[PDB]
Every structure is written in structure tokens, then in C-alpha cells.
Amino acid sequence: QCVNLTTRTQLPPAYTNSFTRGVYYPDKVFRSSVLHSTQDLFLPFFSNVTWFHAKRFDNPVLPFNDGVYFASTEKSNIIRGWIFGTTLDSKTQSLLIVNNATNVVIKVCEFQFCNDPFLGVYYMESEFRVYSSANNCTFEYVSQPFLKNLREFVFKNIDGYFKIYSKHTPINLVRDLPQGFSALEPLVDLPIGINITRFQTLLALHRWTAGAAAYYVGYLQPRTFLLKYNENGTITDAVD
């Protein structure tokens, strides 16, 4: 494997604005209609969130500062997972997430991630061009797959736990993030306990066309929000 495609493309990043997005439930306790102020990692409102597009490749190693907010429209299922890790090489085991068509597999091993990892599709035949070798590891998780049907993901690595929050929303807006407030709900809390400082997304490439999609990467920062809870427990509004 390990085919290289990034010849010279070094276009400057395009910044959209994360108007009011990426606000999850930062607890496992149900709350009625009450004003509760939480002090946790959150994506600041109206922050400059980078805009990457499926076309022009755009699979850079993105720093995992304190947690990232991953939003992708991808009206066709082209996004396949993420390869969070510190070095993405030997001597440092890294976290890998992929869902094929009906099941998600999460592996944390000493992978040999290629310089341009991706997943091939043939008519849907899945081929792995992510890693060349994968051995000497302990963690293995499988469940229902995580995935214009906008979907947002927030990953955070705290106290040795890898926490994933997701919320799938159908949108009709043309290109950018929607206007409505949406509350993300956690999927899993994997006790991975590794050091994570960078990550990279995985696409589905045809035989090398890059389809037509885009993903949004914003970084969490420590902030104190005021979550407005509804009667059913849904966070209908929040302020910085």
C-alpha cells in the first residue's frame, strides 16, 4: 500500500465561522428546565473553524490541541474515520476508527499509517490503504457504525478516556454551517489512555477522484457555558 498523491497542493486554509455549534452534554446526569453553568472544554461561539474540502485531497496531519470538533456534510458517504495519534509511526501506538458499511471498528495499535491514508471503493469493495502493518496491541472495539445529513463529532482525550460526541442533523443550507442550535450526545467513552497530539481524516477515493464533500475542524478550548435545559432535558440554548 502507501501510495502518495500530494504532489504540490499547498493551498491556504479557508476559514468559515462556527456560529453556534459543537455544544454537547458535558455530564451523564439528567436535568429538567434549569440554568446550569458548566466549566469544561467547549468550542467558542462564532469561532474561526477551518474548512477542508474532499476535493483537492486535503488530508493534513491536524494538531489535537485539547480536543477537536469534526463536522462534515458529505451528502455521499465518503468520510470513513480518523487516525488520532501522536507520531502516526512505530514506537507510538495510535488510535484508529473506521466503519465499513454496517459496523465500526476501533483499533489502538502501533500502526504504520501511510503518508496518504484512505479507503478505496469499487462497485462497494473496501480496500485498506491506511496502514502497512498493525500488531502488538491490546484494545479492540466494534459496534454500530458512527455514520445533506450533516454530522458533527467532538473528540476529547481527558484522564485517559477518549470521549466521542455525535449528532446527525439533516440540513438544506448550501455550503456552510447551519443556524440552528444542536446538542451533541455521547456515543462511547473508550478507556484508551494514550497520548494524542495530532489526527488525520480518512476518505473514500474512487478509481483518484475525491468525490464531492467537505469537513470542518475546530478546536475545543476551556470555557464556561450556561446551558439552557428544556423540560425533556435537551439543551435548547447556551451562552459563552
Measure the CA–CA gap between 23 and 56, rounded to whole angstroms. Answer: 30
Mind spelling out the 3-state secondary structure of the chain? CCCCCCCCCCCCCEEEEECCCCEECCCCCCCCCCEEEEEEEECCCCEEEEEEECCCCCCCCEECCCCEEEEECCCCCCCCEECCECCCCCCCCEEEEEECCCCEEEEEECCCECCCCCEEEECCEEEECCECCCCCCCEEEEECCCCCCEEEEEEEEECCEEEEEEEEECCCCCCCCCCCCCEEEEEEEECCCCCCCEECEECEEECCECCCCEEEEEECEEEEEEEEECCCCCEEEEEC
208: CATH? 2.60.120.960
Domain count, the chain: 1
Grid coordinates of 106? 476501533
Range of the structural domain that residue 57 is part of: 14-239
The size of the chain, in residues, is 240
Instruction: Note whether residue 5 is domain-resident.
Output: no
For CA atoms 49, 54, 57, 62, the dihedral sign is positive
Question: In whole angstroms, how far apart are CA 187 and each of 25, 176, 183, 228?
Answer: 11, 25, 13, 22
Query: What is the dihedral angle through the alpha carbons of 103, 104, 107, 112, rounded to the nearest 10 degrees?
Result: 100
Residue 10 makes CB contacts below 8 A (sequence gap 6+) with none
**Is 1 within the bounds of a domain?**
no
Dihedrals phi, psi of 49, to nearest 5 degrees: -100, 130
Q: What is the resolution of this structure in A?
A: 3.4
What CA–CA distance (Å, rounded) separates 20 from 1?
40
Whether 6 maps to a domain, the answer reads no
User: Distance from first CA to last CA of the chain, Å, rounded?
Assistant: 46
Residue that has been written with the C-alpha cell 500530494 in this structure = 6
